[PDB]
């Protein structure tokens, strides 16, 4: 479902962003909350005001999770099992919200890395985020 070319595109793009990933996670969340206000209802405990320390810190966690996924493209269910438990069993996040965050991740990457964000890379990253979303919204105990 992810092609060999997809995996190459994902790994290469993710390596290029390097240590900026954490920041981009924060920005993507900010974009998601601003563009799609209903997503904020999952974070009532968060200060969601500009410059939020909670959002910045959480963005780092999201980025780290995606970094883990990049290292395990052939076994996402195994690698992200704990995150599936959280998002599927405990948080019970509507799959629609994953589409919204994935879109804002693409937007964030396009904003920062125009040379890297080719149509082919765009396509591979969308499939990457979709694959991760499916795992986190699935109950597979």
């Amino acid at each position: 479902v992810l092609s060999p070319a997809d995996k190459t595109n994902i790994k290469s793009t993710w390596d290029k962003i390097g240590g900026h990933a954490g920041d981009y996670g924060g920005e993507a969340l900010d974009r998601t909350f601003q563009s799609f206000p209903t997503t904020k209802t999952y974070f009532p405990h968060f200060d969601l005001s500009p410059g939020s320390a909670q959002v910045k810190a959480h963005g780092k966690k999201v980025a780290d999770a995606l970094t883990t996924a990049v290292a395990h493209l052939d076994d996402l269910p195994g690698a992200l099992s704990a995150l599936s438990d959280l998002h599927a069993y405990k948080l019970r996040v509507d799959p629609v919200n994953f589409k919204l965050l994935s879109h804002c991740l693409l937007v964030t990457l396009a904003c920062h890395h125009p040379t890297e964000f080719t149509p082919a890379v765009h396509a591979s990253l969308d499939k990457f985020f979709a694959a991760v979303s499916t795992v986190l919204t699935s109950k597979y105990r």
Binding site: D30, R31, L106, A110, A120, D126
Partner: protein
Amino acid sequence: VHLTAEEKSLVSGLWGKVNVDEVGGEALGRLLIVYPWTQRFFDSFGDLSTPDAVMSNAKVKAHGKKVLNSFSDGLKNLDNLKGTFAKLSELHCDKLHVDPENFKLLGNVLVCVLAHHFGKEFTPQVQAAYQKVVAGVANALAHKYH
């Protein structure tokens, strides 16, 4: 769709800077690559078999310019999107049989292209405003399906 004065300004400020010759073709091209089933509707457009073929496709570029102009029509008619797009809604439904979900996809791809072109200028605030626009256009084009 209702945009506040602030949201309208954020949209208009960016839109005036848009390359009208390139952005629409890039949006359409990316739609055809990222969501490749959309290629089904474009048999008369010639080679779409590779990303490079799609992005160098002259007809995709020309049609993209028309799509972008149609978005520009929506921006000038935000309070009457259903009326502006009723004829186009009829076309996409009755003649073309395009599933409405794809209208949302093109809207989001256009957003990605705007982000690509404007970088840091495409702020979260500017994006939020544009999401209201593209959702409005997608809803308007889907109106005659119901």
